[PDB]
Design a binder for this molecule. Structure first.
Ligand SMILES: Nc1nc2c(ncn2[C@@H]2O[C@H](COP(=O)(O)OP(=O)(O)CP(=O)(O)O)[C@@H](O)[C@H]2O)c(=O)[nH]1
Ligand SMILES: [Mg+2]
Ligand SMILES: [Mn+2]
Ligand SMILES: [Mn+2]
Lengths: 292, 174, 499
């Protein structure tokens, strides 16, 4: 597995006509999953991260929105990246998107990091299009390889002991980060529990306490839940993805929680913009917003 | 959904020897998955908000060491508990006689003649390795006058929810 | 701070403990940011527990309590220890797991009486050479730390009983650690070890050896001298062969896992190496052909796992695995199942999904105890009639197969509970399904070739969820089909000819 050649064959298309496909032999894609899962398992589930860092949100199967991020913020190794889940489903070019992200994780384990999102379940990607793309392009077995690798993804991460990064949001069962480190993997997201809420919850302002999502897998939370979570464990930012915002980045509950969505023109029917966040040593966070 | 304030908290201590399934039974009940790896335990504290008999509760389950090497802290963990699951493998004969020692230890630490605990027979799905039968389990269960539950933690779970739920009913009885 | 471009309770407990002169003072789970200086007054305190609190640094009055043996500080935010703690000449137990420690403090190196040390889930990067003073140490555990090398002095730890070094980025092990001869619990899981020292075989009594998820290429021949082993785990290890270490270790061997290795054949040795085995995990690594008679001496064996391999044809000795309970052959290249399968009388679960199975053998009707038959993506033209004799089936799926008709023997499977037949181009089915009243879930999704449902199925009323969202149903009116599975259930209840 030449991580470098792969990266070259995938970045060759950069700057060209959008929607162009990149043909990879299947054993690179299987090899990328097998090699990267060990990197996921060796590192802790609750990841500790060091500045400088450039963070992100969701890029659903959109390989030419991804390459725009790497230009604005900078390609590795001259920068460090964190991706908060949801890179598959809905978008047309998903195999190319996930392959590039999985490539930089192998070659830069201490500077590249990927979390887990909701569409990393074996069941959710069945409905929402990732199941179909695997059929026509490569195979049915290759889809099972991805969901095996998705099981070993870290659930949350902590940056400079101040920034808390999760795709979905908090859980009522979370009273200490010690519990997150006790989660056993490889695991599948259940209908209820501590794990599920982290890949599925979402803040909703109206609920002062807790309330059910519009979807029927988990339940929301409120502005008081995050604050009591931040003051207890001595943090100051909860960075999230999951949903779709118009401006790319939106702030919830007095900034303590910021959501980042980086796939503009979602699935071809949205006017949303994309955003990426960079944080330096003094923990100043700056936003690099992609044009709608 | 979950009640905002004044939620009763129950500290359930899972006590037994090594290999009696204390960790797997706790992982199954909390994360709905079965772990096939044998990792010795020192102290694991889980938490969950669940509704039992139309009543919400917090099931603070505290897995314990079991083995004497790690049991240097074991007697301290028993002291703060509220209910005990004396878990013994039906395929492990030795852990069955140790139920008496565990009951004596629980009575000694908490300084009481009778305490709420339930004898739990784990690994019941291993029928062709079963060595402790149901009547043998029950006669010792009534010998100490404690409830008896059959339980398997491998998918699909058998009474795994019931085992924790039954003790919660037992604890609120007094 | 990021920018955009308990004390009252604890003091009372100390006062109480000071009055009763108790050997124990418990301040655990009280979330104390700072342990009070008053702790010094209680000199005669055998044990102190401060775990799960918010302490960042201990006060220097800990040194005053010489009459102390047990200290618990785990799950805190500690970064350093006071130097006055060296005055404790009687301390033998220290708990410092799940902390923000960056390196092992020099204070710990100056405690001779210490016996058990818990340094786990920290940011320890180096281990100093001044552990010779810790001659009385017996329990040392490091579970989540960033050490890169172990000091050469560790071989002098004669009193050490358990060494737990996992997830600790170790590139090598000291060659002289085998001079302890008193360790039975050594774990090196999820490290980066490249090789094992040859002196590890001098450990006469070793029971637990966690050695998975490390980039080993082989194992030392000397390791076979440890006759107390029970479970040898080798997941994600670049191993291709073993030097007959199993035969010499056939003493208390229980389970063997060789998952996700780079294997290409079974380890070179006699069939006796699996005499006392109980489980096996040979998944994710190519195996090709299993040799004949290699499982003859496995009198006890419960499970086999062979997922993600290159199996082409099962060996002719398949019929002699009478003591085997479970099997798993998913994601392989199996072509034909021989008639010898009739000998597996005790078998209970059999999975054969993702293979090339045109037709099932007629010997399947002999195996009474079977409960599972997963045959997804096998390209099955039709099932054999021998399914009627079996009784104990409870969950079988035939998804992604080319079957168009089912055998008449469906009503005999009275124990059947879960059946999956979707995406199979099914046209018509026998009426015997009505006898099966215990069904709960059934799948016929994405089948364009069925038009009418049997009237006898109307008698099955215990079905709970039916997935027919994507189904043509040309003969039946779209209103009842698109109304919902429940509306069809009532349509079965009285609109059907049966009552
Ligand atoms: N078949 C079956 N196996 C079980 C069951 N419960 C646990 N196990 C087995 O137990 C093993 C894990 O043992 P574990 O629970 O960690 O041991 P323990 O009893 O908690 C004591 P220790 O502190 O030494 O770990 C798993 O490999 C699993 O196969 C069960 O209900 N059925
Ligand atoms: Mg345990
Ligand atoms: Mn999402
Ligand atoms: Mn999303």
């Amino acid at each position: 597995l030449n991580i470098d050649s792969i990266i070259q064959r995938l970045l060759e298309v950069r700057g060209s006509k959008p929607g162009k496909n990149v043909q990879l032999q299947e054993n690179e894609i299987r090899g990328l999953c097998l090699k990267s899962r060990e990197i996921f398992l060796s590192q802790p589930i609750l990841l500790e991260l060091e500045a400088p860092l450039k963070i992100c949100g969701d890029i659903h199967g959109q390989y030419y929105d991804l390459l725009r991020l790497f230009e604005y913020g900078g390609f590795p190794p001259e920068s460090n990246y964190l991706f908060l889940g949801d890179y598959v489903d809905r978008g047309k070019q998903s195999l190319e998107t996930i392959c590039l992200l999985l490539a930089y994780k192998i070659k830069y384990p201490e500077n590249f990091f990927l979390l887990r999102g909701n569409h990393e379940c074996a069941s959710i990607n069945r409905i929402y299009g990732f199941y179909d793309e695997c059929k026509r392009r490569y195979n049915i077995k290759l889809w099972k390889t991805f969901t095996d690798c998705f099981n070993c993804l870290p659930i949350a991460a902590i940056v400079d002991e101040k920034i808390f990064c999760c795709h979905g949001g908090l859980s009522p069962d979370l009273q200490s980060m010690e519990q997150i480190r006790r989660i056993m993997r490889p695991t599948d997201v259940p209908d209820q529990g501590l794990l599920c809420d982290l890949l599925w919850s979402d803040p909703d302002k109206d609920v002062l306490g807790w309330g059910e999502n519009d979807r029927g897998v988990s339940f929301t939370f409120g502005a008081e839940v995050v604050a009591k979570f931040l003051h207890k464990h001595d943090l100051d930012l909860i960075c999230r993805a999951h949903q779709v915002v118009e401006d790319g980045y939106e702030f919830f509950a007095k900034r303590q929680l910021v959501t980042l969505f980086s796939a503009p023109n979602y699935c071809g029917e949205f006017d949303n913009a994309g955003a990426m966040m960079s944080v330096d040593e003094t923990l100043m966070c700056s936003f690099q917003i992609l044009k709608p | 959904a979950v009640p905002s304030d004044n939620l009763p908290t129950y500290k359930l201590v899972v006590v037994g020897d090594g290999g009696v399934g204390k960790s797997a039974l706790t992982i199954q009940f909390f994360q709905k998955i079965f772990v096939p790896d044998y990792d010795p335990t020192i102290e694991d504290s889980y938490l969950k908000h669940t509704e039992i008999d139309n009543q919400w509760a917090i099931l603070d389950v505290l897995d314990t060491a079991g083995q004497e090497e790690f049991s240097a802290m074991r007697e301290q963990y028993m002291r703060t508990g509220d209910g005990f699951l004396i878990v013994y493998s039906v395929t492990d004969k030795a852990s069955f006689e140790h139920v008496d020692r565990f009951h004596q230890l629980i009575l000694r630490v908490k300084d009481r003649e009778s305490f709420p605990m339930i004898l739990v027979a784990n690994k019941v799905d291993l029928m062709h390795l079963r060595k402790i039968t149901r009547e043998q389990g029950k006669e010792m269960a009534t010998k100490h006058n404690i409830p008896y539950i059959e339980t398997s933690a491998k998918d699909p779970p058998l009474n795994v929810d019931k085992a924790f739920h039954d003790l919660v009913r037992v604890i609120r009885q007094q | 701070g990021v920018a955009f471009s308990s004390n009252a309770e604890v003091i009372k407990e100390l006062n109480k403990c000071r009055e009763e002169n108790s050997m124990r003072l418990d301040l655990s789970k009280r979330s104390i940011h700072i342990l009070p200086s008053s702790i010094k007054e209680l000199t005669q305190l055998t044990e102190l527990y401060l775990y799960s609190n918010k302490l960042q640094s201990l006060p220097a009055e800990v040194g005053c309590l010489v009459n102390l043996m047990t200290l618990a500080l785990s799950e805190n935010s500690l970064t350093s220890l006071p130097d006055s703690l060296d005055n404790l000449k009687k301390l033998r137990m220290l708990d410092l797991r799940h902390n923000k420690l960056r390196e092992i403090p020099s204070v710990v190196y100056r405690l001779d009486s210490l016996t058990t040390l818990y340094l786990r889930f920290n940011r320890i990067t180096t281990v100093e050479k001044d552990i010779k003073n810790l001659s009385k140490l017996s329990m040392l555990s490091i579970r989540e730390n960033k050490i890169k090398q172990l000091p050469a002095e560790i071989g002098e730890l004669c009193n050490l009983i358990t060494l737990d070094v996992a997830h600790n980025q170790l590139e090598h092990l000291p060659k002289e650690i085998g001079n302890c001869t008193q360790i039975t619990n050594l774990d090196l899981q999820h490290n980066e070890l490249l090789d094992l020292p040859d002196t590890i075989g001098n450990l006469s009594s070793l029971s637990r050896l966690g050695l998975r998820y490390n980039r080993l290429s082989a194992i030392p021949r000397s390791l076979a001298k440890c006759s107390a082993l029970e479970e040898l785990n080798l997941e994600n290890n670049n191993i291709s062969t073993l030097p007959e270490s199993l035969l010499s270790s056939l003493v208390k061997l229980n389970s063997l896992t060789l998952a996700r290795n780079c294997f290409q054949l079974y380890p070179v040795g006699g069939p006796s190496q699996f005499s006392t085995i109980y489980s096996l995990n040979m998944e994710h690594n190519r195996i090709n052909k299993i040799p004949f008679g290699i499982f003859s001496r496995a009198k006890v064996l419960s499970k086999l796992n062979m997922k993600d391999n290159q199996l082409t044809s099962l060996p002719l000795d398949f019929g002699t695995w009478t003591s085997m309970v479970e099997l798993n052959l998913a994601t392989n290249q199996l072509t034909k199942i021989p008639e010898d399968v009739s000998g597996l009388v005790s078998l209970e679960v059999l999975i054969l999904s993702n293979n090339l199975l045109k037709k099932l053998p007629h010997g399947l009707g002999n195996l009474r105890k079977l409960r599972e038959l997963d045959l997804e993506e096998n390209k099955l033209e039709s099932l054999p009639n021998e399914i009627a004799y079996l009784k104990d089936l409870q969950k079988l799926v035939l998804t992604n197969n080319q079957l168009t008709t089912l055998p008449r023997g469906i009503g005999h499977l009275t124990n059947l509970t879960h059946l999956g037949l979707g995406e199979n181009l099914l046209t018509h089915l026998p009426e015997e399904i009505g006898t099966l009243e215990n069904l709960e879930e059934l799948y016929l999704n994405d089948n364009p070739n069925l038009h009418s449902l049997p009237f006898e199925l109307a008698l099955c009323s215990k079905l709970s969820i039916m997935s027919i969202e994507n189904c043509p149903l040309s003969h039946l009116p779209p209103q009842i089909v698109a109304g919902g599975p429940s509306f069809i259930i009532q349509f079965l209840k009285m609109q059907g000819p049966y009552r």
